[PDB]
């Protein structure tokens, strides 16, 4: 009854924003960024190589003090590394071998993991008994998880492949709010530096801003073709970058709802698996399927380096808070700390 | 460095324990299940004995451990968790050969699974769990395959016989089976082999076909590591 009538009006509404977006579009940063000295070739080599994993690596997360990090794999083991002396602080055995995400609490007392079992688990690192044990169980998602992120020490944000993202309360264990409005599987998520807003990347060629307290989809951005694999906040709080299966990265802005740059090359055809900035919004490290990472340039859209020390597909990469090191996981079952 | 020398000692006690876990984990072999609602995946395992979609059944034959990764409740899209299963030794696929209407979409699943970018090394073990229904359906003659499949005007039995029974039933069995095999023999390059089989709901010796075909899957890769092929 109302399906046909409402569809016609919906299409007109989209065109009004599209015309407004086109009208509001003034210029492009490609021409403006022509009066800046190029960064030049950037070369880094491994300083450490973390051995001990016996399966493909899915995700990793750095620490607050830029010395400790955690990683997960198909081995079903969660490992905390000392990136300085290559020592192993802890080795946490997971409950389900199929996991896709990791997190490290800002205070440093907790970690998190989740995956195909539709649960994000919480572990207490600093206990009196001298062992690491699970403290909170978080269930209530009908699809596999893709990203868990702590807010301060007691609120975690989760995005799964069931079209919805939810905000939790660790102490009580119930969803305080629920965020919905997507269409397909959600793959990536990133919290703002001020921990007030966050974005989400779905398998819909669409990404949406959010408000944590209320639960209202503030904005919606489209433009990609295939699914969206990775998302991350620019270290200012006004932008974010999305990595899709089109072998293309592109930069969004929160005051324009339009793309600014697109990082692509004819030779590059393989898809993108991870994206993260580094401490200045000047280097954009992307991890592709063609057996190596890639160091982009978020202002000039040109290549500046390759992390070609890996012999398999790179699935994760992160950068320290201090901006010192850059780890990188892949399917070699090896973790390499570059600099 | 007195405290630092003791920290580096537990890191090597952890390494000793992690390597032990890798020795006990490579003893087993990994398997999948794909099929339809009425295909009969569950009944195959039973004869050989919340939202947790992974059933994860286990069975034993000939002193070799097997783990079968029955994943269910996978929403609507499948192409996002297959890439997590690209390390198994074989994929088990079940087809309803009885329901003629639900056969063109049985080939649809096979064609796309046979051509995954993440499943370009794993060889499929094709199954056909419905065999007794075909014999009873052709004898009763409720419907004719010609309307669904108008290819009997150019097909005949190519000098094959299986026990004896009605040759009318056997020629019907072969047309469906060679329909699936003809899809397979278009992209494999020695790294893919289908192993089609005919099974019923009473058949119990299913586990040998998984076991015997797992020798060839591993034998054919020992001939490749040695540069013999």
């Amino acid at each position, epitope marked *: 009854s109302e399906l046909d009538q409402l569809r016609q009006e919906a299409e007109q509404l989209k065109n009004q924003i599209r015309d407004a977006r086109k009208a509001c579009a003034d210029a492009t940063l490609s021409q403006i960024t022509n009066n800046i000295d190029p960064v030049g070739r950037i070369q880094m080599r491994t300083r450490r190589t973390l051995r001990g994993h016996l399966a493909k690596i899915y995700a990793m997360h750095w620490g607050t003090d830029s*010395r400790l990090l955690v990683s997960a794999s198909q081995d079903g083991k969660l490992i905390i590394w000392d990136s300085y002396t290559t020592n192993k*602080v802890h080795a946490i055995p997971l409950r389900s071998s199929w996991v896709m995400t990791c997190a490290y609490a800002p205070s440093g007392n907790y970690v998190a993991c989740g995956g195909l079992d539709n649960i994000c688990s919480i572990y207490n690192l600093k206990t009196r*008994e001298g062992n690491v044990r699970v403290s909170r169980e978080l269930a209530g998602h009908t699809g596999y998880l893709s990203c868990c992120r702590f807010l301060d020490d007691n609120q975690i944000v989760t995005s799964s492949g069931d079209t919805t993202c939810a905000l939790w309360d660790i102490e009580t264990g119930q969803q305080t709010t629920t965020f919905t409005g997507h269409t397909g599987d959600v793959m990536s998520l990133s919290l703002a530096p001020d921990t007030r807003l966050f974005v989400s990347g779905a398998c819909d060629a669409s990404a949406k801003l959010w408000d944590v307290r209320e639960g209202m989809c503030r904005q919606t951005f489209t433009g990609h073709e295939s699914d969206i694999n990775a998302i991350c906040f620019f270290p200012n709080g006004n932008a974010f970058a999305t990595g899709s299966d089109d072998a293309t990265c592109r930069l969004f802005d929160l005051r324009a709802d339009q793309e600014l740059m697109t990082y692509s090359h004819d030779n590059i055809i393989c898809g993108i698996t991870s994206v993260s900035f580094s401490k200045s919004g000047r280097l954009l490290l992307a991890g592709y399927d063609d057996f190596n990472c890639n160091v982009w340039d978020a202002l000039k859209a040109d290549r500046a380096g390759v992390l070609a020390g890996h012999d398999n597909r790179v699935s994760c990469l992160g950068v320290t808070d201090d901006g010192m090191a850059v780890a990188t996981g892949s399917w070699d079952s090896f973790l390499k700390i570059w600099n | *460095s*007195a*405290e630092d020398k003791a920290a580096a*000692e537990r890191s090597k006690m952890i390494d000793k324990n992690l390597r032990e876990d890798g020795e006990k984990a490579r003893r087993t072999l990994r398997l999948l299940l794909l099929g339809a609602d009425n295909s009969g995946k569950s009944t195959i395992v039973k004869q050989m004995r919340g939202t947790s979609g992974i059933f994860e059944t286990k069975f034993q034959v000939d002193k070799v451990n097997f783990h079968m990764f029955d994943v269910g409740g996978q929403r609507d899209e499948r192409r996002k968790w297959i890439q997590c299963f690209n390390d198994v030794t074989a994929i088990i696929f079940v087809v309803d050969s009885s329901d003629y209407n639900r056969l063109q979409e049985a080939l649809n699943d096979f064609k796309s699974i046979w051509n995954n970018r993440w499943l370009r090394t794993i060889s499929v073990i094709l199954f056909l769990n419905k065999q007794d229904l075909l014999a009873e359906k052709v004898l009763a003659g409720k419907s004719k395959i010609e309307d669904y499949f108008p290819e009997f005007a150019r097909y005949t039995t190519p000098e094959d016989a299986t026990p004896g029974e009605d040759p009318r039933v056997t020629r019907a069995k072969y047309f469906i089976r060679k329909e699936f095999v003809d899809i397979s023999t278009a992209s494999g390059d020695g790294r893919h082999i289908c192993y089609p089989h005919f099974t019923c709901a009473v058949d119990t010796e299913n586990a040998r076909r998984i076991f015997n075909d797992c020798k060839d899957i591993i034998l054919q890769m020992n001939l490749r590591e040695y540069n013999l092929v």
Partner: single-chain antibody
Amino acid sequence: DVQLVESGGGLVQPGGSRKLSCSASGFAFSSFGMHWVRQAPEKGLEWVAYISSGSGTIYYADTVKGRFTISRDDPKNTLFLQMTSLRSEDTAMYYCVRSIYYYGSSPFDFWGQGTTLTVSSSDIVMTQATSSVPVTPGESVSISCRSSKSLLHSNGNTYLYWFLQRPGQSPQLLIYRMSNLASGVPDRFSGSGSGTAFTLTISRLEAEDVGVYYCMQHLEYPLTFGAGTKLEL
């Protein structure tokens, strides 16, 4: 809860033998190192031995090298010390201590109740210059130790520890790397120093602060305590 209970004391002739034992409970007694510490009657504290997790590396005090033996039984959850040919200087009170060594851990957390043994009739030296101090509640008191060598390492740590031996009690951690404060004590306590000279700092004193202050180094395994510093109202 965590509790170390130990026994095995008594009277020993000058030349006999004796064996002590701890009883670890309430914690994973498979990832912690272990120690022993003496206390001569109305004197300080001194080491007896050491053993790590997995019984890998052992160290001994030079005073009793080749005469004492320390053994471990992980499934039994019990530590052992065997003494041979006891002398007349071995009359003291023995303590059981746990220690875990990884990045950020606090060694020497828990101390045992203690047993008394009686017998019938190149190193970093630290001296506590001050012996006794009369204190009043509500004031600030600074307590210092002196070091023979600088404890600062190339890492950046400074292996200095502090302990509280209240009357009829056992020592407990306050500060374990001259800066960091162990969990379970009020924030009024503090510690500071640089290389050679060290000092404590207490803001507001209460009634239950009377005892003896001890200081530690953790650089060279022949580890040595300090003298006594008594605080009295």
